[PDB]
UniProtKB/Swiss-Prot annotation:
One of its GO terms (cellular component) is protein kinase CK2 complex. The gene is CSNK2A1. Residues 38-323 form the Protein kinase domain. This is Casein kinase II subunit alpha. It is an enzyme of class 2 (transferase). Belongs to the protein kinase superfamily. Ser/Thr protein kinase family. CK2 subfamily. It is linked to Okur-Chung neurodevelopmental syndrome: An autosomal dominant neurodevelopmental disorder characterized by developmental delay, intellectual disability, behavioral problems, hypotonia, speech problems, microcephaly, pachygyria and variable dysmorphic features. Phosphorylation does not directly affect casein kinase 2 activity, but may contribute to its regulation by forming binding sites for interacting proteins and/or targeting it to different compartments.
């Protein structure tokens, strides 16, 4: 018989009604800028798929970021480019300023606006209750926008949320794992970072959607209000589901599995055990209590659910009482 199909409960048909050119990234013709406009200053980091540099646009003396892509998985490149251009101008979305061909790597190099970022490790130790709510709302603006545009990020994690704390500014970055949502489409479950992988990924359910980002967001929220980084600390993808099950319980996991007619990897049989759902108060202590409120716990509870269809959508999340105290623009 196989697994039961699933559909996003919102923005389901956005791509089906757009021109083919919008989501057919393979046919996208990249318009190239002049690589000589930019001078590399220092290397900021090297990821699995790229190297990131601080640079300067010598045509306006403005600081920029240059992301030089590695010559691996070429399809991945046009996908990120198309998604960046599609989302450009949206609230709290990183702005792609240019695309040039790097003369040395002989690969595409993405030029982004410069954002004076604070290290998340140092920053999460600092955030007040108000600031957690403020920045969560800003992240939600970004996620609702890309979801409404038919795109799931699929790599929401602290590293991909760049915050300029001095100016109260936030950008969602690295859309290299982002995809267009097409209802009924089966996707690769090898996305996101381990600690932020939704249950759908960990049980190998391929027909997922925007709600994946909302699980990841929930993981971030839990790490912020409970001051535990990361909140679900698996030592591999299998232990990762066990960690989640020790909090949300095994019965709701099996119900989830049963609902979508999924068959768990049999290796879970000797390690999953039997666990009751824990009350969120379990994780409150003297050092995080000032960050926890009934509102915060209700919100978290509605994000961290096994069933991806039952999680709050981005727009619903923005309606939650948790954000009543946040001053709106
Ligand atoms: O992949 C992307 O979309 C992407 C977009 C923008 C940036 C910019 N990053 N900036 C900084 C950075 C990156 C890695 C490690 C350290 C830093 C840093 C330190 C101070 C000021 C800015 C940055 C990256 C990727």
């Amino acid at each position: 018989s196989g697994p039961v199909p699933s559909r996003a409960r919102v923005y389901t048909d956005v791509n089906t009604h757009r021109p083919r050119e919008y989501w057919d990234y393979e046919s996208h013709v990249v318009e190239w800028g002049n690589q000589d406009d930019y001078q590399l200053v220092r290397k900021l980091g090297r990821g699995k798929y790229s190297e990131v540099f601080e640079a300067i646009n010598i045509t306006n003396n403005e600081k920029v970021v240059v992301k030089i892509l590695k010559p691996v998985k070429k399809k991945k490149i046009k996908r990120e480019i198309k998604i960046l251009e599609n989302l450009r101008g949206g609230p709290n979305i990183i702005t792609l300023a240019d695309i040039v061909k790097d003369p040395v790597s002989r690969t595409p190099a993405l030029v982004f606006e410069h954002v004076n970022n604070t290290d998340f490790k140092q920053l999460y130790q600092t955030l007040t209750d108000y600031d957690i709510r403020f920045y969560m709302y800003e992240i939600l603006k970004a996620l609702d926008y890309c979801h409404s545009m038919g795109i799931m990020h699929r790599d929401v994690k602290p590293h991909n949320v760049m915050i300029d704390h001095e100016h109260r500014k936030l950008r969602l970055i690295d859309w290299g794992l982002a995809e267009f949502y097409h209802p009924g489409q089966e996707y690769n479950v090898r996305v996101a970072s381990r600690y932020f992988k939704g249950p759908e990924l960990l049980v190998d359910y391929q027909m997922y959607d925007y709600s994946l980002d909302m699980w990841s967001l929930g993981c971030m929220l839990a790490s912020m209000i409970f001051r535990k980084e990361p909140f679900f600390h698996g030592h591999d993808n299998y232990d990762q589901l066990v960690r989640i099950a020790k909090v949300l319980g095994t019965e709701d996991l099996y119900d989830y599995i049963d609902k979508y007619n999924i068959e768990l990897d049999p290796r879970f049989n000797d390690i999953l055990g039997r666990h009751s759902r824990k009350r969120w108060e379990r994780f409150v202590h003297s050092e995080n209590q000032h960050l926890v409120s009934p509102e915060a716990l209700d919100f978290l509870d509605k994000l961290l659910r096994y069933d991806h269809q039952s999680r709050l959508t981005a727009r619903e999340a923005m309606e939650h009482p948790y954000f009543y105290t946040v001053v709106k623009d």
